[PDB]
Each structure stands twice: as structure tokens, then as C-alpha cells.
């Protein structure tokens, strides 16, 4: 009887809420009130990268903390040496509307995808000298929204097809398919241990997925609108989210509920990108305002602002070494920011 | 700069040269987004001129046109339509052979028109499949007033000069469809977007010229605003 199944679903959801409430013995603001404030972060534009012809959608850092990959709707992946601003590669893409780019942790490959519904893996270290398409990965009744490398052979992808997929790059086949969402999946974040990853979707829910088991371990539902961005906290026990509603939220996997909410009434525009600093004390978000804002991840106070963009920030990646914050915008520029002193 | 850094900078400069050489082309090309239900002859128009997106290219009077048709993507358009915030026009094709389909087409036109991100993109509105509309309204087996009751009182505006050889009944029906879309066009937007209704059929060879003239006008209005004339 379908009616009893949906009533059981309602009772299970109420049990979930009851358990989460029982675990809410305190709140992050109450616990962290005593911690010294971060103070005004005055990050300054150290580098401006002016190569792209059109809007920059995504960028990602190489593990070396020096090289960038940057995607623009002109159909170009430009690999930037951030220290010298030199362009290491310009990769012409067979599809122009590219929404995501990824840099392999080894630096050998970069992935990109978009409205072509294909995740194209490019080999940067060929003997022939030119960057070539190593493989094209294609199954999705939807645009590819975010791709992230687990290793040189495995790449997770998310699409408007309401699904995420783990691809075996050598064979070009989906090893596992993650299907628990109901809207478009817009962002992925791999846990530091690469065993789990969290996907935000337009269904206003962020789901944690076990990469090996292929099952949704938990679902988080605090937001009111599309979760445009998601980023794991550096220890893998929490992850931040950003939504069209101008609120970021910090979720803890162990507590299975919101720990903090980051919103200020002067902000009425949706989060486009979210990433933590190395220590996790700073949460950085792009907004469409057009500036970025730095949030004290524990005190929730707005610690600073990065103003230098002429159009909406679309991407925001903190270097693995923690030494710089890249910010791409539809103005076709990437700005690399670092501390004042 | 060491010997290697100088050569790296030379490579960067050559890449910049390529980026400028293809920036010229990118800025000379006019980008178009083609939308419409499966009932609408997007495929016929493109045949007369990456499963997710099809980039058709065509050229009129040495001006390059890129036409993107978004295919195997879920119908919750809200998200990916952000990308096309910077296109010369949206080519919206609707099947004019009247049925319940046409009200859904009107609602889709509304959603495209009032989208926050398309707030400044003109819509070239191809009321396609006019041959079938003429045949259907001449046969009379199904009549537009069955679905849009306001047609019982609608009478042909005098200012709309009829095409030669077309029956007044066909003219009235097609003008009513045109007006029903134009009303959605005018109800919102302070002139930042304009709809350009065009009647067309599968055999029509003129569509590329129509898009050329419409992009002409759209770029002219963009220039007038940008150069402060208006």
C-alpha cells in the first residue's frame, strides 16, 4: 500500500528530526563566543590574469599550489602559472559552454565539461607536446556541473540529470551512479580522504555519498533554495554550502545537522562559490553582489571583503598550501589574493 | 629571468597572440540561443540553414552566426539559462498549429521573457508551421476559440497589412497568436528587450535573413544605449 509507505516515510522523517534535535545540546555560536575574533582581513590583489575572452565559470588549483586551470565560455582552458602569470597552456575545447574544470591531483590531466553533457579529460604531459583529449566521458541526460579527480583514473561528475557518477577514465565507463537527488546537482566536494563526497543540488539539499559503497549516507536539508556551491571542511568532518538564498551553512557529518549559518542583511544575492582556508577558520564565498566575503567559520562574523571584480564572482578556490585565494568572475579576469603582511 | 623563464614568457606571449586572434573572431560572431518544444520545428529551421548542445553555424552577408540548440537537458531550465545572459538574441520557435500545446508554449515564452538573467536579451519569435495553421483553420475541424475563448471577439487589426493571397480567416488566426505572444512581450520590460514575431514554414528559405535583420536591430539598439544617444 503506497499510502502506508508514504506515511512510514513521514514517520521516519520525524524520527530523523527528533534525533537531530536530541543531539542539539548546544550551538556553535554559544560554544565559540569566547574565541578571539579573526579581525579585519585585508587581502590584496596580488595577481590579475587577463587571458580569457569571455566569462570565467570554474577554476581549480593544482596540488603544487602554483598552477591554475581556468574555464571560460569561449571554449578555452588556460593553465596559468600563478607566480609569474604566464600562460602554460591554452586548450581549445570542442564545446564552448563549459561550466566546470578540474585539475588532476597529479597534474597530468585536466577535466572539463558543461552543456555538452561530456566530461573531457585532457592529457597535459604528452610526448607530442600538445594537450590532447585523453578521453570523453558521456552519459548524462543533463549538463555537467562539477567534476573532481579522485586520482588519475577516477573522476566524479555531477549533472543536471539529478545524478552524480564515478567514472573509470581508462575504460570510460561509470563505475557507480549516485541517484538520490531530485534537482540538478550543482557542486561536488571530495573529502580529504577521498572516501566520501558531498553534492549540493537545486533541491535545497546536500547529500553525503560513500564513493566506494555507492549509497547516500546522509542528507542535509537546511537551505531554502538551490545549493550552488559546496566545500568540505579541511578535516572531513564538516562541509560548507552556499545557496541562491544569500545564506551559507556549515554542516557537521557527525552531528548530522547545521552548526552555523552565515547571513547578513546587506546581502540579497546568491552564493556562487564557497571554499575554506587551510585551517578552516575562514569561509570564503562569492556572491553575485559582485564582491567576495570572508566569514569567520566559528564566530559567523563577516571578517572581510574582496571587492575587485566588475561582474559576479563565479569561482573561488583556496590554494592547497593556503597561501592564496583565486577568484574568477564573468568579467573574464582571475584575481589572486593573499594576506596583507 | 633565467633562460627558461624567458622562453616560458615567449610561449605565454604566443598564447596571448592566439587569444587575441580568436578574440577578434569571437567578438565578430553573433551568438544565438534556439529554444522551443519538440512540437516546434527547430530541427527543420536548422536543416534549412555533445548530445546536450548543438552548435549550428551559418553566415549571412559575411556576418557569422552561432546558433546553440540545447538538446538532451532536463526541462528545469532555471539553471543553465544563466550561461546565455550574454547572447545577441533568443530564437524562440513555437508550433502555430493550434492545440493545447500552444498555451504551454505561451507559458514557456513567459518564463524565458521574465527570467532575471535574460532581462536584456531580445527574443526572435518564430511562429513556425504556418502552412499547417492555414490548412487547419481552413478545414475548421478544430478551431482556436475552443482553447483560447477570446478569439470569438478578436477582429483583425486594420494596421496589420495582410499578406497577398491569404484568406482573412487565416490572417485573423495567425494575428491572434502573434498578439497573444506580443502581449506577454509588452507586459514587462522597460524596453530593454523587444520581441520580433515572424511567421515561417518548413519550406521558408528566408529565415537566416530574418535573423540577420533582427540582430541588426538588436545591435543597433545596444549601440544607441551604449553610446548614450538614447
Amino acid at each position: 500500500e503506497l499510502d502506508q509507505l508514504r506515511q512510514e516515510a513521514e514517520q521516519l522523517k520525524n524520527q530523523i528530526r527528533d534525533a537531530r534535535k536530541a543531539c542539539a545540546d548546544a550551538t556553535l555560536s554559544q560554544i565559540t563566543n569566547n574565541i578571539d575574533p579573526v579581525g579585519r582581513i585585508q587581502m590584496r590583489t596580488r595577481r590579475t590574469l587577463r587571458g580569457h575572452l569571455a566569462k570565467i565559470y570554474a577554476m581549480h588549483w593544482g596540488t603544487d599550489s602554483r598552477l591554475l586551470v581556468s574555464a571560460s565560455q569561449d571554449g578555452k582552458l588556460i593553465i596559468w602559472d600563478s607566480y609569474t602569470t604566464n600562460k602554460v597552456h591554452a586548450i581549445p575545447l570542442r564545446s564552448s559552454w563549459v561550466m566546470t574544470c578540474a585539475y588532476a591531483p597529479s597534474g597530468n590531466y585536466v577535466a572539463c565539461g558543461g552543456l555538452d553533457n561530456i566530461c573531457s579529460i585532457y592529457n597535459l604531459k604528452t610526448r607530442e607536446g600538445n594537450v590532447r583529449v585523453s578521453r570523453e566521458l558521456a552519459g548524462h541526460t543533463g549538463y555537467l556541473s562539477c567534476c573532481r579527480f579522485l586520482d588519475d583514473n577516477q573522476i566524479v561528475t555531477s549533472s543536471g540529470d539529478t545524478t552524480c557518477a564515478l567514472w573509470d577514465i581508462e575504460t570510460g565507463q561509470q563505475t557507480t551512479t549516485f541517484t538520490g537527488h531530485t534537482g540538478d546537482v550543482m557542486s561536488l566536494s571530495l573529502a580529504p580522504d577521498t572516501r566520501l563526497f558531498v553534492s549540493g543540488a537545486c533541491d535545497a539539499s546536500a547529500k553525503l555519498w560513500d564513493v566506494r559503497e555507492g549509497m547516500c549516507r546522509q542528507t542535509f536539508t537546511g537551505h531554502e533554495s538551490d545549493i550552488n556551491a559546496i566545500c568540505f571542511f579541511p578535516n572531513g568532518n564538516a562541509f560548507a554550502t552556499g545557496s541562491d538564498d544569500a545564506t551559507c551553512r556549515l554542516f557537521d557529518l557527525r552531528a548530522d545537522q547545521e552548526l552555523m549559518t552565515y547571513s547578513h542583511d546587506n546581502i540579497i544575492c546568491g552564493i556562487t562559490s564557497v571554499s575554506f582556508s587551510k585551517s578552516g577558520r575562514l569561509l570564503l564565498a562569492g556572491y553575485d553582489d559582485f564582491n567576495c566575503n570572508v566569514w569567520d567559520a566559528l564566530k559567523a562574523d563577516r571578517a572581510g571583503v574582496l571587492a575587485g571584480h566588475d561582474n559576479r564572482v563565479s569561482c573561488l578556490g583556496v590554494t592547497d598550501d593556503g597561501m592564496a585565494v583565486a577568484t574568477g568572475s564573468w568579467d573574464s579576469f582571475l584575481k589572486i589574493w593573499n594576506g596583507s603582511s | 629571468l633565467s633562460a627558461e623563464d624567458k622562453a616560458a614568457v615567449e610561449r605565454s606571449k604566443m598564447i596571448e597572440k592566439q587569444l587575441q586572434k580568436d578574440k577578434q573572431v569571437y567578438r565578430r560572431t553573433l551568438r544565438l540561443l534556439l529554444l522551443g518544444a519538440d512540437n516546434s520545428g527547430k530541427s527543420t529551421i536548422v536543416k534549412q540553414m555533445t548530445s546536450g548542445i548543438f552548435e549550428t553555424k551559418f553566415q549571412v552577408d559575411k556576418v557569422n552566426f552561432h546558433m546553440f540548440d540545447v538538446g538532451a537537458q532536463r526541462d528545469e531550465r532555471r539553471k543553465w539559462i544563466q550561461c546565455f545572459n550574454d547572447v545577441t538574441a533568443i530564437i524562440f520557435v513555437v508550433d502555430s498549429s493550434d492545440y493545447n500545446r500552444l498555451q504551454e508554449a505561451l507559458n514557456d515564452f513567459k518564463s524565458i521573457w521574465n527570467n532575471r538573467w535574460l532581462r536584456t536579451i531580445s527574443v526572435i519569435l518564430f511562429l513556425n508551421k504556418q502552412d499547417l495553421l492555414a490548412e487547419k483553420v481552413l478545414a475548421g475541424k478544430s478551431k482556436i476559440e475552443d482553447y483560447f475563448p477570446e478569439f470569438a471577439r478578436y477582429t483583425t487589426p486594420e494596421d496589420a497589412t495582410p499578406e497577398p493571397g491569404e484568406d482573412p480567416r487565416v490572417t485573423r488566426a495567425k494575428y491572434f497568436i502573434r498578439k497573444e505572444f506580443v502581449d506577454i512581450s509588452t507586459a514587462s520590460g522597460d524596453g530593454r528587450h523587444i520581441c520580433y514575431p515572424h511567421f515561417t514554414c518548413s519550406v521558408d528559405t528566408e529565415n537566416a535573413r530574418r535573423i540577420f535583420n533582427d540582430c541588426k536591430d538588436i545591435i543597433l539598439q545596444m549601440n544607441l544605449r551604449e553610446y548614450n544617444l538614447v
Partner: single-chain antibody
Amino acid sequence: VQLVESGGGLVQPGGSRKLSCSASGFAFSSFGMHWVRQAPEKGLEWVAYISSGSGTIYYADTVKGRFTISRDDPKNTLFLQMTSLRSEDTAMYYCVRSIYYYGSSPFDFWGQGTTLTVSSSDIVMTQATSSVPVTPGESVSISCRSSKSLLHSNGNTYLYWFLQRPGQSPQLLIYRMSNLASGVPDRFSGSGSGTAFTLTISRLEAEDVGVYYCMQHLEYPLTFGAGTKLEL
């Protein structure tokens, strides 16, 4: 990937000759090209350089004016035209591939060569010994001492190591100290202080027999060492 040189032969002194090299199997346009000569039973010597897009050209002081280097990208052919040959120019001329960007491996491919017979501020690279006897399975060490500290302010130490086996073109082993290109990583390694450098072979094999050449890539007059020949 092939670089096949053409030309060579015998030339009377004062004549002109036109070496050419055909590139196949790689994006020739994106690669900078070098000419490196080897006089009979002597060491390698740098000749000329032409960058991608022909934007930059350099010559050895012993070659300026006399030889001109040019490239025809659409025909995938490199050229070297010699205006007034001398007995000192008798050597096997190798076409050498180079590509320059962060993490690139310059001098990664060497053509087979063309034998041409004719009827300062430069960084002196000194190699400790001309020869070193060794047997398979032994750990080995080859050392080089530059006349100038190659450790640039950028942190890179622009020192290169090449192996030339009998009858083969030089093969790039280590392109910047501790960076291994064609490596057998369990065997080859390299380190240096920025003025003294050493290449270590952890377990020598029969394939390691050959002359090991050090090269610097900090200043354009590119100076190779005299080479250390390992014998077994």
C-alpha cells in the same frame, strides 16, 4: 616522434652547406629547437637556438654570423645554413627538441644526427673525471662543478644530465637536478649544492654504459661538460 637530419657529407673549407631536420610525430610548431654538435671523439657543443614562432635566436660565439638557423613550421623542417665552414666545424650535428614552461623538460629529444666533414663569460662546466670503471649492480656517482652558481633566485637549479650510448644520440636523464625525465626512477637520481652537482646510479646495468654529459641552462651560451665515460 622522430627528428631525422639531412645534409652533411664532405665539404671543402670555406664552402657552404645546408643541414635540415624533419620533425614528425610531435607539434613541431610549439617546440623550440637546438643544434648541438659533437666533434669526433670529443664532447658535445652548443651551436644555435630558434624558439617557437622564431621569436628568439641565439648562436654560439664560435658560430655567430657564420651559420644561420631557420625553421619552416608548416613543413616541419628545421634548417641550419653554414656560410664559411672550417676544419673546427667537423662534427655530428644533432637536432634537439626543447619546450619551455613550468615543469617542462627541455632537451628531451635528440635526432640521430648528420655527419659533416670539412676537408670568457661562458659558464665553464668541469666533470671530475673522464672515465670511471664499473660493473653491473654497483652504485655509481658522476659529478660536475660549474664555474657559476646555477641556483637561480627562482629556486630552480638549471643543470641537465645526458647519457650518450655508443652509436646513439644523447638521452636526457635528469633535466633539473632531482627531476627525472626518461628515468628508471629506482636507479637514476641527482642532487647538488648549486655549484657542485652529482648524478647517482643506484644499481648499474649494461644499458647504462655510455658518456654522461652535464649541461647548464642558465645563460644562453649553453656549455656542456667534457663527459664521463662509464666502462664495464
